[PDB]
């Protein structure tokens, strides 16, 4: 009987209190500059928020507590059957700094399963949305409606002492974690509430696993999709604090709203144009460029296709958000899951998913135009799911929202740990600059 | 008639763009430094946003285009009967940086009107709200659903000039500013939203005395608590952006999330206990204060009260200001409406709030650790609400969530008609920090 997840958190509590103790000695020590273009260019490139669990590496990529994608994949724990990481796991790396045991992630992923129910008024709630109202609302607000069963609301109402904040926190996580996907399932299957609502979880199964099954899509036939799924949302789970999902988590949540608020917020910055719709981008892209250019193409039509494209003012979606010198290693992780699964190396719009970074990034280098010519995970994330039957990309952001929760989350627990106080900077006019 | 509120914005934003290129050509001015006090403080004291509307003097407290609260109480229209300055022309005010005539707020008073009307989906939802469900969730879920009503949304999917953001950013906030007193006042009375979500508005009647009529409290009997209502609402609408509600929609529309999912971030912000909750914790403070010196006290009964809470190293709510030298104008402006009723005077928690503001101010000095110990808008809110029979606490973050959709609103349309980008700021790890 090992440590269950908040033992496990409770051990390396201390550590980072005192390593918080050490950096806060040094407080008035200088580590940067404001200038006008900060003020005036939404804080780009000021350094000035605290996030523990997930650190850009201008080489490596994304790295979770100095892990890479790859060491991660290696590393964590796998489901009862599939080849990828489960998220449940990252979850607990994110949280921990520590590698869970296979022991210890079945227990967690058990645990998930008991909490994965919900109210009776979340399903009314549902039940009473338009079919026109867009999923990402939706997302956001069931997942706030289920402040009514926040154990830090009450808590705070009943008095809790500041060293007790994290506790009550980590509960309300663990609850909105549990619960997400099949508010997610939901959104997805709005004919289909009352029977969604209450269908029973395999507890002995993952996270991942019971999604893919909330949505129509469990058993032995759709092993692949779990996998994939598993992969997703784990690879999604958190990059850096400073994308407005995690911000406005942190933000919403340093005023001590509980986290279905605070993660509620961060899913209203998800619905945001500018944040959550890459994949889908990407996804109409692809088609088009297909439907223009056959489904037997040469390396000159899409060579020649990226050309018009940028000749005509056009972006590339999907290349180019990174400062690395490779691709993102997200996107080689989805690539990766590919090569192993040979219907889905026989989808043409895969293949052409494929073809494209071989020869974009190249384009995109003459071209000149971009700083960095390389994929991101937007570039395969679509078409994986589009291949396996998911071919309505308004609800792409639904999937990434139940990624997301996992690192904003994390983040919470340790802001309530530590003590961080509400997010507070200071505004100016125009006039004021001069 | 005169120009109109949208066609007064459009003749004030050339001299913001040219401004706001005279700033830009400025960018690599450099105007603070960032220490780790800032990283691991909630950003306090590091000057990274814009706002427009308001900025705070150290002498004069909170400005509003450069106008005291003094300025705007002599200066800006009242309504057709009563002593305070509307919020619509507040509303007017900080959008356009000019003082609307009477004529323009009754005709903007009407637009209000004639828009306050609610789809059956958001009624059919607050209908589906358990009694259990805190007031500001509730808010905060109906705010974000209407978004099925936003052109802003709809605009941006058909394809929208940059350049064009702000008109459709403008209906989409007038919209919400004349709905969600509507919203509110549902929240209020659960047991009446047949007839609260279509009673049709007065359109000669301004947007507070409306909103006093959702609430049951229309009709000449009430004309003082109109005049409460309106000082309240334009009180309340803006102080910097720097305040959670105020940067949650700010943030959250920087992805360009339209106003609807912008405002509701906001008030999930102000939702939480260490942003919306202070009129309240000020309201008990002094009830508990009054049960405890008794009917027959003195100066030093009070004076002595004041030592034991600061003794039992608790706070005196609604007193202490980051920077203010002086009272919050926005309290003296509560004092100066309370001074001339006598029926608020007879009150004797009201008296009880005065006599601490007479008493505290000397008492926290000598003590010694409250930076300004001076009485802020807080101190006196609760009460005068309390005075007119809301005498349910858990309500006053609601009426705040009414008039803050009046700051961070305008701050979202001059976002848009600037092209100020999505908010980013960098992350940092403890360990990075060494």
Same mark, same amino acid.
């Given at each position: 009987?090992?440590?269950?997840?908040?033992?496990?958190?409770?051990?390396?509590?201390?550590?980072?209190?005192?390593?918080?103790?050490?950096?806060?000695?040094?407080?008035?020590?200088?580590?940067?500059?404001?200038?006008?273009?900060?003020?005036?260019?939404?804080?780009?490139?000021?350094? *000035?928020?605290?996030?523990?669990?997930?650190?850009?590496?201008?080489?490596?990529?994304?790295?979770?507590?100095?892990?890479?994608?790859?060491?991660?994949?290696?590393?964590?724990?796998?489901?009862?059957?599939?080849?990828?990481?489960?998220?449940?796991?990252?979850?607990?790396? %994110?949280?921990?700094?520590?590698?869970?045991?296979?022991?210890?992630?079945?227990?967690?992923?058990?645990?998930?399963?008991?909490?994965?129910?919900?109210?009776?008024?979340?399903?009314?709630?549902?039940?009473?949305?338009?079919?026109?109202?867009?999923?990402?609302?939706?997302?956001?607000?069931?997942?706030?409606?289920?402040?009514?069963?926040?154990?830090?609301? @009450?808590?705070?109402?009943?008095?809790?002492?500041?060293?007790?904040?994290?506790?009550?926190?980590?509960?309300?996580?663990?609850?909105?974690?549990?619960?997400?996907?099949?508010?997610?399932?939901?959104?997805?299957?709005?004919?289909?509430?009352?029977?969604?609502?209450?269908?029973?979880?395999?507890?002995?199964?993952?996270?991942?696993?019971?999604?893919?099954?909330?949505?129509?899509?469990?058993?032995?036939?759709?092993?692949?999709?779990?996998?994939?799924?598993?992969?997703?949302?784990?690879? +999604?789970?958190? +990059?850096?604090?400073?994308?407005? *999902?995690? +911000?406005?988590?942190?933000?919403?949540?340093?005023?001590?709203?509980?986290?279905?608020?605070?993660?509620?917020?961060?899913?209203?910055?998800?619905?945001?144009? %500018?944040?959550?719709?890459?994949?889908?981008?990407?996804?109409?892209?692809?088609?088009?460029?297909?439907?223009?250019?056959?489904?037997?193409?040469?390396?000159?039509?899409?060579?020649?296709?990226?050309?018009?494209?940028? @000749? *005509?003012?056009?972006?590339?979606?999907?290349?180019?958000?990174?400062?690395?010198?490779?691709?993102?290693?997200?996107?080689?992780?989805?690539?990766?899951?590919?090569?192993?699964?040979?219907?889905? %190396?026989?989808?043409?719009?895969?293949?052409?998913? @494929? @073809?494209?970074?071989?020869?974009?990034?190249?384009?995109?280098?003459?071209?000149?135009?971009?700083?960095?010519? +390389?994929?991101?995970?937007?570039?395969?994330?679509?078409?994986?799911?589009?291949?396996?039957?998911?071919?309505?990309?308004?609800?792409?952001?639904?999937?990434?929202?139940?990624?997301?929760?996992?690192?904003?989350?994390?983040?919470?627990?340790?802001?309530?740990?530590?003590?961080?106080?509400?997010?507070?900077?200071?505004?100016?006019?125009?006039?004021?600059?001069?």
């Amino acid at each position: 009987a090992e440590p269950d997840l908040k033992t496990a958190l409770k051990a390396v509590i201390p550590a980072k209190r005192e390593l918080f103790k050490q950096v806060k000695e040094r407080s008035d020590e200088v580590i940067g500059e404001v200038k006008v273009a900060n003020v005036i260019g939404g804080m780009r490139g000021l350094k *000035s928020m605290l996030w523990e669990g997930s650190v850009l590496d201008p080489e490596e990529g994304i790295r979770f507590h100095g892990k890479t994608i790859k060491d991660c994949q290696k590393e964590l724990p796998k489901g009862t059957s599939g080849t990828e990481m489960l998220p449940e796991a990252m979850f607990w790396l %994110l949280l921990t700094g520590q590698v869970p045991s296979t022991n210890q992630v079945r227990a967690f992923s058990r645990e998930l399963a008991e909490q994965s129910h919900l109210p009776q008024h979340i399903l009314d709630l549902i039940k009473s949305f338009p079919r026109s109202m867009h999923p990402m609302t939706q997302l956001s607000i069931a997942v706030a409606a289920l402040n009514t069963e926040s154990k830090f609301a @009450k808590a705070y109402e009943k008095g809790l002492s500041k060293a007790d904040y994290w506790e009550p926190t980590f509960d309300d996580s663990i609850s909105l974690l549990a619960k997400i996907p099949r508010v997610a399932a939901l959104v997805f299957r709005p004919d289909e509430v009352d029977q969604v609502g209450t269908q029973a979880l395999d507890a002995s199964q993952d996270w991942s696993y019971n999604f893919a099954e909330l949505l129509g899509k469990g058993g032995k036939e759709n092993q692949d999709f779990h996998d994939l799924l598993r992969l997703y949302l784990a690879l +999604h789970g958190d +990059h850096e604090g400073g994308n407005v *999902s995690a +911000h406005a988590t942190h933000l919403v949540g340093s005023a001590l709203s509980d986290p279905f608020l605070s993660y509620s917020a961060g899913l209203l910055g998800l619905a945001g144009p %500018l944040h959550g719709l890459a994949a889908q981008e990407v996804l109409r892209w692809i088609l088009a460029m297909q439907d223009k250019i056959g489904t037997k193409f040469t390396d000159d039509d899409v060579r020649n296709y990226l050309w018009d494209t940028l @000749k *005509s003012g056009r972006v590339v979606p999907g290349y180019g958000h990174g400062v690395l010198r490779k691709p993102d290693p997200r996107f080689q992780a989805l690539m990766d899951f590919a090569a192993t699964r040979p219907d889905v %190396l026989a989808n043409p719009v895969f293949q052409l998913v @494929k @073809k494209n970074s071989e020869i974009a990034p190249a384009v995109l280098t003459e071209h000149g135009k971009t700083k960095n010519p +390389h994929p991101n995970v937007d570039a395969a994330s679509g078409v994986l799911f589009y291949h396996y039957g998911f071919q309505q990309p308004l609800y792409y952001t639904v999937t990434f929202g139940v990624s997301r929760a996992l690192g904003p989350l994390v983040q919470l627990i340790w802001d309530r740990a530590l003590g961080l106080p509400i997010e507070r900077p200071k505004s100016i006019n125009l006039l004021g600059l001069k």
